[PDB]
Ligand binder design. Structure first.
Ligand SMILES: *[C@@H]1O[C@H](CO)[C@@H](O[C@@H]2O[C@H](CO)[C@@H](O)[C@H](O)[C@H]2NC(C)=O)[C@H](O)[C@H]1NC(C)=O
Ligand SMILES: *[C@@H]1O[C@H](CO)[C@@H](O[C@@H]2O[C@H](CO)[C@@H](O)[C@H](O)[C@H]2NC(C)=O)[C@H](O)[C@H]1NC(C)=O
Ligand code: NAG
Ligand code: NAG
Lengths: 48, 48
């Protein structure tokens, strides 16, 4: 039910964040792309 | 006219930001260094 990012050769699940992923293109080009939520670690720092 | 950062094996121009570059030394040492503007994605998040 949940999506994670882990190193290729060892299962170690991490919360998908903007510090773990990079942005390129959009959803209309990538084949098989799935909807999820990406955590921004800067957002609750501004809110707090 | 504009400066970009791209991967060396495939042209894909990106806006020069602090998340694409690292800081080391100053302008008085590097030979051939040029003037440009480095974008900070943190600044408009604080301003807004
Ligand atoms: C992932 O989410 C996007 C955006 O919420 C979905 O794209 C929308 O899908 C609805 C229903 O199919 C359409 O009526 C809208 O026109 C779409 N909006 C956009 C921006 O294209 C997309 O369908 C979702 N993917 C899945 C499989 O749930
Ligand atoms: C890049 O910009 C810097 C700073 O704006 C320039 O530094 C100036 O250089 C002139 C001539 O050498 C000096 O007289 C000034 O004192 C410098 N100004 C400042 C604010 O330090 C620099 O010349 C520019 N480099 C290029 C390649 O034009
Ligand atoms: C994978 O293949 C199945 C066919 O068995 C298809 O229904 C599905 O959409 C495919 N998914 C992707 C991401 O290609
Ligand atoms: C590059 O070569 C030109 C000569 O065509 C010279 O004017 C310029 O100063 C040189 N720049 C560097 C960084 O070597």
């Amino acid at each position: 039910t949940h999506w994670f990012v882990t190193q290729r050769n060892f299962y170690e699940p991490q919360i998908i964040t903007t510090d773990n992923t990079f942005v390129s293109g959009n959803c209309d080009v990538v084949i098989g792309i799935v909807n999820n939520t990406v955590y921004d670690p800067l957002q609750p720092e501004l809110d707090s």
